[PDB]
Amino acid sequence: SLEQVSNLRNALYKLQNDDGPNGYEAIASFHGAPKLCPENATDRYACC
Amino acid sequence: SLEQVSNLRNALYKLQNDDGPNGYEAIASFHGAPKLCPENATDRYACC
Secondary structure, three states, X not given: OHHHHHHHHHHHHHHXXXXXXXXXXXXXXXXXXXXXXXXXXXXXXXXX | OHHHHHHHHHHHHHXXXXXXXXXXXXXXXXXXXXXXXXXXXXXXXXXX
């Protein structure tokens, strides 16, 4: 319904806006890009 | 928030759209072109 759909909409928008250590980009970078795997290596791969 | 985003977007949309005596474009032209200040003068200058 409207209440839950709007809460989800607001939550999505604010998590997208957030640029913290647990932001959307920080939490999604583990899967596809930009290859932050492993930690402190010359050549990096995917943690996928 | 997303609802606040919508509210501000609507407000700025009508502000840009209308051209009343409080016209946003007219009041913003002061800081630069089209050389409004001063009145009744052949040569003007930037109001800022």
